[PDB]
Design goal:
Radius of gyration of chain A: 17 Å
Order of helices and strands of chain A: EEHEHEEHEEHEHEEH
Structural class of chain A: alpha+beta
Pfam families (chain B): BMC
Protein name (chain B): Bacterial microcompartment shell protein EutL
Subunit structure (chain B): Homotrimerizes to form a pseudohexamer.
Bound molecules: sodium ion
Subcellular location (chain B): Bacterial microcompartment
GO cellular component, one term (chain B): bacterial microcompartment
Oligomer: homotrimer
Number of domains of chain A: 1
Number of strands of chain A: 10
Strand content of chain A: 25-35%
């Protein structure tokens, strides 16, 4: 139902210790990246936000993170979900700490929100008060700055992004041009904390508006 | 049933009246693009043809047009369908006109055609007599030239494209290499309107022959 | 159930006897490529392996080979499956011979293997003892050299690739970064035949290990959160 939180779920977690040189090469790891933390989940944007949080909570970098084509509901296997993330660190301890922070964030109450009665339209409007090393790299903004992470289905996202950009003094840093692998769209916007918040609120309101009147 | 038209459906339409400068930047709009028209639908190629038709009826440009992975039947949300299109124009009135032309075309009787009994194989064989500014650009030909717009599932499309190219005096302008986002394939072919129609007819016949005999290669 | 072979199926096969120049150009064919063989199936990596077998059996090259987004289970049409392959040769006879070998290989008993009770996790751990021209070119090795062709879902594949690389004297030739179109991942590894077999064995064991315990981390390391 409308305004319900869609609960995100982690599906698998594993660790690689003393990563093989052949794999380190293909993943373009740094010399000091000895251990990898692997995670899959059924919600990509929540997991991306969680991985970024992990770079704050632990001595890890996000070295790989990709979404699956057509989304979790179309997964052909049990553990694929719609996202794979890989953290890299100097030791299993740091990688485990990163994965724990990732899990904590995923389970913290964050998630996509339903915009209609049968949850067939959903959106993500998450304000990140200070970016870690992953989302700042991705957005092309300074580490530690705030951002609004805004995602919705393609038309809703374009309409609502326009509403968000007019609601506050924010800049569009990275555009998730539709379709993402999961057939969504969105952007990372940056500005002051209060501006980003204002953008998240306007975005959510605008998605709900389209959902209530798709053909008007 | 074979030869049945598969009706295309529009799912969502909205107008942005005064696009924000930030959005205008990431969409790489031109300064004269003040208003956007957004549309999604459950059939990508019909929509692309419709959008191109809109550029003939109004002063709008197709500034964005993309298909969704795995097609409308696999959409995870209500309004995603399998295509999003964005028209840009100088005013909301002009964008509204372009959207109305787009909608009219989508509901004009064009569409994919079934090749078999349960409609599990379908194809698009549409002759565009006079391209607008969108398809001409993507095909790399002058505006106002004719196209055969040919789409089918991957093998059917490769086989039928060969038949189309042999049936008529046409050239391949743009190859939709399998898979497109929707797991189809095909091409835009150009030539005279009559040659394009002949290519459409041959493509159609060839897709149907594969559907009736999918494993036969001897 | 676990260790069950997943049977691959061919969906469509055709020959273009005399390819048009317009198509030859877009496919970037060689002048001597006069005929095309087309095939679709519901399992991409088995079909790729089969196409490579074709190049050992007849005068054909693999000139096109691509997987479908989100895999065969999400196909929206009857013949799309999850793969299209195109062979090119100098004549219809050679293409027919190539397609024949392709079909035979697909129906030989090769296939993905299930890792759990409901076959919701599967993998491919195929030792190609003698590569044809397609896989050897893909891997950047000489024809006839051995390959381990390893594929599994994304996390399983990353974990199991690391296991495979450590279990034998092999080199990573090609990495299929997750997601491939079908939302899998894997690699082609090369080495001696025995080394490739060891890699295949280690890969299979590692995937089954993840399948049986995908979230062991929670109890071991995530307690008191
Ligand atoms: Na599906």
């Amino acid at each position: 139902m409308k305004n319900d939180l869609i609960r995100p779920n982690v599906l698998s977690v594993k660790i690689i210790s003393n990563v093989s040189p052949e794999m380190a090469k293909k993943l373009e790891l740094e010399p000091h990246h000895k251990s990898l933390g692997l995670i899959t989940a059924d919600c990509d944007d929540v997991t991306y936000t969680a991985l970024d949080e992990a770079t704050k909570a632990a001595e890890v970098d996000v070295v790989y993170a990709r979404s699956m084509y057509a989304g979790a509901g179309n997964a052909s296997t049990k553990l694929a979900g719609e996202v794979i993330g890989i953290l890299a660190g100097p030791s299993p301890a740091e990688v485990r700490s990163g994965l724990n922070a990732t899990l904590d964030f995923i389970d913290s109450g964050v998630g996509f929100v339903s915009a209609n009665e049968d949850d067939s339209i959903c959106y993500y409007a998450q304000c990140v008060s200070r970016t870690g090393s992953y989302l700042s790299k991705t957005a092309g903004i300074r580490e530690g700055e705030a951002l609004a992470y805004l995602v919705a289905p393609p038309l809703e996202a374009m309409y609502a992004l326009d509403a968000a950009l007019k609601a506050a003094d924010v800049e569009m840093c990275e555009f998730f041009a539709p379709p993402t692998e999961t057939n969504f769209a969105g952007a990372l916007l940056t500005g002051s904390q209060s501006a980003c918040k204002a953008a998240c609120d306007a975005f959510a309101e605008a998605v709900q508006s389209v959902a209530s009147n798709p053909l008007g």
